[PDB]
C-alpha cells in the first residue's frame, strides 16, 4: 500500500533551528527541501506501522518567509508547507530493489542507536553512550553478520516478487524486538512487511507463523517445518533480547532517565493554539479546557514532534464570558495556562 506523507514545519524553540518533520509515508522515496537553503537531513527512520519519518533542519525568523517543499509518489503536487512507559528494543530491516538497497537501524525507546547501510557497509553508533561503552571489536562482528543478513534479505525479496508476480521497485521490511513493562513483565514481537503491509507475524506462545495472504502462506509452511528455528526465535525474544535491552539502559541511564519540562506558549489567529517546547521524556498530555472541562469538538492534536535536541514538542488547537485554558501534564505535574476569556 501507499501512504501519503504528513509534514509539519516548526522551530526548535519559540536564532533558531528550522525543523521540517515528514512522517507516516511510504514508499520511503522522498525529497525534502527547505526554502532554497541548505538543510541537513537526518537518517531514514522506521516506525512500528511500517511507515517512515524524517527530520530536516537548518532561522531567526524576522521580516522573512520560510517554507518546506516535499516530493512524494502519492502527491501530484510537490507540497510545500509554509511555516505560519514500557522500555523497549526494536530492530528494523529495510530491503530495496533500487536510497540504499539495505538499511538496518536499532531503536531503544524510539531512540536511534545502531545504523547499517548497504552502500558503505559498517555498523556505527547513533548514540554517544554506544560508542563509549561498546568495544570497537563489537561493531566488528555486526558489520559481518549484517552483510549476511543483507544478502539474505535480497534473496527473500527476489523470491517474493517472483512469488507475487511483479518486478521493479518493491520494499521488504522486518521488525524484531522485545519490550519490558513497568511492572516487570515482558513480551516480544517479530514481523515482516511487503510494500508497507503486514506480511508475516510470529507468535511465540504457539510457536507458529501467521500468514495474512495466500502467498505469505507458502513461506509459512516453509518456516514452520523448521521447528527448531522457531524454538531458537523464542529464546532470543524471551531471553537474549531482554538482556540486550537491560544492557543498553545501564549504558544510556543518563539520557533516558533525564526529565525536562515543557515551556507552554499560547496563541490565536477563531482558532487557539497551544505549543509545548523542549520536553522529555516524550510522554505528555495536552488538551484545551473550557470552564473547566476538556474540549472535544473542533480540536486538533499535532502528535509528538522531535525538537532536535533529543527533546520534543507538541500542540493542541481549538476553534472558538467563558475561559479557555491549556492543560499540560509532563511529570504529572498538571500544568494549566489560561489563554483567553
Amino acid at each position, epitope marked *: 500500500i501507499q501512504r501519503p506523507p504528513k509534514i509539519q514545519v516548526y522551530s526548535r524553540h519559540p536564532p533558531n533551528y528550522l525543523n521540517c518533520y515528514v512522517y507516516g509515508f511510504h514508499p520511503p522515496q522522498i525529497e525534502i527541501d527547505l526554502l532554497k537553503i541548505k538543510s541537513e537531513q537526518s537518517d531514514l527512520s522506521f516506525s512500528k506501522d511500517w511507515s517512515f519519518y524524517l527530520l530536516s533542519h537548518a532561522t531567526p525568523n524576522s521580516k522573512d518567509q520560510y517554507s518546506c517543499r516535499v516530493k512524494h509518489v502519492t502527491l501530484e503536487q510537490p507540497r510545500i508547507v509554509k511555516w505560519d512507559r514500557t522500555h523497549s528494543l526494536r530492530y528494523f530491516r529495510l530491503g530495496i530493489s533500487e536510497i540504499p538497497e539495505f538499511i538496518s537501524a536499532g531503536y531503544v525507546d524510539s531512540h536511534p542507536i545502531t545504523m547499517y547501510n548497504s552502500v558503505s*557497509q559498517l555498523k556505527e553508533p547513533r548514540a554517544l553512550w554506544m560508542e563509549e561503552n561498546l568495544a570497537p571489536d563489537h561493531w*566488528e*562482528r*555486526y558489520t*559481518q*553478520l549484517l*552483510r*549476511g543478513w*543483507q*544478502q*539474505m534479505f535480497k534473496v527473500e525479496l527476489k523470491q517474493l516478487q517472483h512469488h507475487y508476480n511483479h518486478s521493479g521497485f518493491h520494499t521488504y521490511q522486518r521488525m524484531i524486538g522485545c519490550e519490558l513493562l513497568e511492572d516487570g513483565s515482558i513480551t516480544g514481537f517479530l514481523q515482516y512487511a511487503y510494500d508497507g503491509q503486514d506480511f508475516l507475524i510470529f507468535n511465540k506462545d504457539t510457536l507458529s507463523w501467521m500468514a495474512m495472504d495466500n502467498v505469505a502462506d507458502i513461506i509459512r509452511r516453509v518456516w514452520e517445518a*523448521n521447528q*527448531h*528455528e522457531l*524454538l*531458537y526465535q*523464542k*529464546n*532470543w525474544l524471551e*531471553e*537474549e533480547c531482554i*538482556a540486550w535491552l537491560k544492557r543498553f539502559l545501564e549504558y544510556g541511564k543518563d539520557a533516558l532517565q533525564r526529565t525536562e519540562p515543557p515551556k507552554v506558549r499560547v496563541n490565536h489567529k477563531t482558532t487557539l493554539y497551544c505549543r509545548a517546547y523542549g520536553f522529555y521524556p516524550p510522554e505528555i498530555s495536552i488538551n484545551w479546557m473550557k470552564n473547566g472541562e476538556e474540549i472535544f469538538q473542533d480540536t486538533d492534536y499535532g502528535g509528538i514532534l522531535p525538537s532536535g535536541d533529543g527533546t520534543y514538542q507538541t500542540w493542541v488547537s481549538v476553534e472558538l464570558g467563558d475561559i479557555y485554558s491549556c492543560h499540560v501534564e509532563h511529570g504529572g505535574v498538571h500544568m494549566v495556562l489560561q489563554g483567553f476569556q
Partner: antibody
Amino acid sequence: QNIDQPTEMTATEGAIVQINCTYQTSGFNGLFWYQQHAGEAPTFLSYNVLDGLEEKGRFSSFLSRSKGYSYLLLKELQMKDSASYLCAVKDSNYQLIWGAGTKLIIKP
Amino acid sequence: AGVTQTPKFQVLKTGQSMTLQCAQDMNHNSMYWYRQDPGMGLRLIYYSASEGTTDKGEVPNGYNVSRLNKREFSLRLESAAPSQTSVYFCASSVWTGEGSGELFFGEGSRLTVLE
C-alpha cells in the same frame, strides 16, 4: 568464554552412557552436539534451545539454560558409536564456541 | 552434494607457500575454515559470512583466505610454520546464524610442517 566436557569415557556395548557438558558464556543461542568419528569430519547430532529433552533415534540430548548444563544420552550402545562427541554453544554474538570433544570408547 | 576439501594430506618444509581448496555443492552462503588440534576444540581461523566479505577468526595469525566463487573457499598460508601442523577443516552453513544452522564439515586436511 568457557565450555567443558569429559575427555574420555568407557562403556561396554549395549549399555547406556551420558556425556555431560557445562558451559559459561556471555549469551546463549542454541547448543550443539556433533559426532566425530575417529579420523573423520564431525557430523551434526542434535541442537537444543529451550529447556527440555530432545530425543532423536537412540540418541537423546537435554538442556538446562539456568544451570548452563547439557548432557548427551546414548541408549543401546553399538560399536559404531565410539567417537569424539563435540559440544559447542553459540555466543551472545553468533560465533560458535567449541568444547574439546568427549572420546567414547565402546567395549565389545 | 557434500563439501569437497583438498588436499587430504600435506607435507611442507618451513617457509613453503601452499593453498587448501574447499568446495561446497549445497548452495550455502556461509563458509568456514577450522584448525583442530589434540586436547583442544575446533578453532576458527577465518570466515566468509557471505560472498565478498570475510573476517578474521579466533586465530587469524599465519593464515589468509579468499572467496573465489560463492561455492569455493580457499585457505592459504604463504609461509609454513611448525606450529601450523594440524588437521584443517572446512565447513559450510546455509547462513551465518540463523542460530539453528548446523555446520557441514569437509573430509579434513592433514598437514605436517617440518624443518
